[PDB]
Amino acid sequence: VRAAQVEAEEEGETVYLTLFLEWTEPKDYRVQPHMNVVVPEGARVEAGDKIV
């Protein structure tokens, strides 16, 4: 995970950090011999796009 921007507020002897984070999470998919991958290596897919 990486922090794009950082907003801070001072209150008392503490700082409250509002972080605009950006990160990626994996979800594995199993492919069977009757299935074929219709997507190249490292391509971008949206919601609804077909992968296999």
Partner 1 sequence: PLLTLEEEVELARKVEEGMEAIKKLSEITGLDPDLIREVVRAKILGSARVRHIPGLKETLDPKTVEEIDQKLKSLPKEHKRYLHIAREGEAARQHLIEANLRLVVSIAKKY
Among 33, 40, 42, 48, binds partner 1 (CB under 8 A): 33
Say whether residue 2 binds partner 1 (CB under 8 A): no
Q: Minimal distance in Å, beta carbon 19 to partner 1?
A: 43
Name 17's Cβ contacts closer than 8 Å, sequence gap at least 6. 6, 7, 8
Among 2, 30, 34, 44, binds partner 1 (CB under 8 A): 34
- Provide the b/e sequence for 6-18 (b: ≥16 CB within 10 Å): eeeeeeeeeeeee
Which residues of the shown chain bind partner 1 in the complex (CB under 8 A)?
33-34, 36
